[PDB]
């Protein structure tokens, strides 16, 4: 609300969302693929 890290936390909000992407949501997309992608089976 004042001249504090909130000014940085607004930019750190984007960095935290990117880190959450990289570590959780990219894994979510990987799981979505693994569910949607085919399975190596017998010929």
């Amino acid at each position: 609300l004042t001249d504090e890290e909130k000014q940085n936390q607004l930019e750190q909000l984007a960095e935290q969302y990117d880190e959450l992407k990289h570590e959780f949501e990219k894994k979510l997309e990987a799981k979505r693929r693994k569910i949607t992608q085919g399975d190596d089976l017998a010929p």
């Binding site: 984007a14 990117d18 992407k21 949501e25 979510l28 997309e29």
Partner: protein, 417 residues
């Protein structure tokens, strides 16, 4: 380290930079792979990579960022857009995205979007809150687009004849009807040059579909603007994709309050491509056209309109007649009753090399009083009443001899009285 700055440098400088970096032999590698390896080696040091491109959302849910140097063609170095980002930013097909891109990790084949810095050449806050194109209030052509150069050049005669025959405004939807060998190429080039010279603020786009590569490379190296083309060496699916990308970019620019002008010369070729890519429905119309094949090009044509809140979309298409195929004749007869401007060209005048071979009698503009003054309208009426009794070639020769006496049409109008 921008994508547009790297996709324009020559091969020699990229090979030199890659040999200085210490990568694999670049003399036997393509430019795209060279740029890819250079970006990888640059990012391994800890540097940022920037990219941009037009969004193309696929049917499966994800999309790619096509480049503007390959006429929106699927390339190996396209930027991948995850569906999570689409849900977060409410992305749609046509939204230009610019920002930092991360290189593909182990197990990936496309670049990921780190963060979006600019949306449609504007701030993201202004592009996230907006009104759709389907909600804009349509109107008739209001703004006047004067095509007269004024420099007294010999090429300005064609522009003067075009202005006297049928003035063009912002949001106009017309058709350029012409038989083969009429000279549509020179006329389109002159129109594009006049638009780029007199109205540099408007977004000029020249869309060529199913044309020769020589005409493509001639158009790109002549006009001062963006030219998206698709030669006949590509299937009709490529043509449909290019048309969709172009119309989506035009709609987005209109939504961003821009004056877009599309110079299409393939309405018939586009209709043929749509008829070729449409699944068979067991019902064939006169000439071999599917019942649902005209829907897509009809919507593409009707997308042009004038917006009162801001911006405008002008689409000038050229139709092909007397090509020996009844399908083109049916397409022309169907699309004739849709637009409100027809600029016919005479083959008899074109055979005599009397350019421009323009049919002045058959030409005209509906609601021309909204784009011309009362005095100009009366002068055009008098000129048409004087020209109508004469023959086509005779009228063209008379007009040329009259325009050769002065530089501007105002002096001719003042001398006629």
């Amino acid at each position: 380290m921008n994508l547009t700055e790297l996709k324009n440098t020559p091969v020699s400088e990229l090979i030199t930079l890659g040999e200085n970096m210490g990568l694999e032999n670049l003399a036997r590698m393509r430019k795209q792979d060279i740029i890819f390896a250079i970006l990888k080696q640059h990012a391994k040091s800890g540097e940022d990579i920037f990219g941009d491109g037009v969004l193309e959302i696929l049917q499966d849910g994800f999309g790619f960022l096509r480049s503007a140097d390959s006429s929106y063609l699927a390339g190996p170095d396209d930027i991948y857009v995850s569906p999570s980002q689409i849900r977060r930013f409410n992305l749609r097909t046509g939204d230009t995205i610019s920002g930092k891109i991360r290189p593909p990790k182990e197990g990936e084949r496309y670049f990921a979007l780190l963060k979006v810095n600019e949306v449609n050449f504007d701030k993201p806050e202004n592009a996230r809150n907006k009104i759709l194109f389907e909600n804009l209030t349509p109107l008739h052509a209001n703004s006047r687009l004067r095509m007269e150069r004024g420099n007294g050049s010999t090429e300005d005669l064609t522009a003067r004849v075009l202005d006297l025959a049928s003035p063009i405004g912002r949001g106009q939807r017309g058709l350029i009807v012409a038989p083969p060998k009429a000279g549509k190429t020179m006329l389109l080039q002159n129109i594009a040059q006049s638009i780029a010279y007199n109205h540099p603020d408007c977004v000029l786009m020249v869309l060529l579909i199913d044309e020769r590569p020589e005409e493509v490379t001639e158009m790109q190296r002549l006009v001062k603007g963006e030219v998206v083309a698709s030669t006949f060496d590509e299937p009709a699916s490529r043509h449909v994709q290019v048309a969709e990308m172009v119309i989506e970019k035009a709609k987005r620019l209109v939504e961003h309050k821009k004056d877009v002008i599309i110079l299409l010369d393939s309405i018939t070729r586009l209709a043929r491509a749509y008829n070729t890519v449409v699944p068979a429905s067991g019902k064939v119309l006169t000439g071999g056209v599917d019942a649902n094949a005209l829907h897509r090009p009809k919507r593409f044509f009707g997308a042009a309109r004038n917006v009162e809140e801001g911006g405008s979309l002008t689409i000038i298409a050229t139709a092909l007649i007397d090509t020996g195929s009844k399908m083109d004749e049916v397409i022309y007869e169907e699309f004739k009753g849709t637009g409100n401007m027809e600029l016919h060209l005479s083959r008899k005048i074109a055979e005599k090399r009397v350019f421009p071979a323009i049919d002045y009698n058959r030409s005209g503009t509906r609601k021309e009083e909204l784009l011309t003054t009362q005095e100009e309208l009366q002068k055009m009426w008098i000129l048409r009443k004087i020209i109508h009794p004469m023959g086509e070639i005779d009228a063209m020769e008379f007009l040329i001899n009259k325009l050769a006496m002065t530089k501007t049409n105002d002096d001719f109008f003042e001398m006629m009285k």
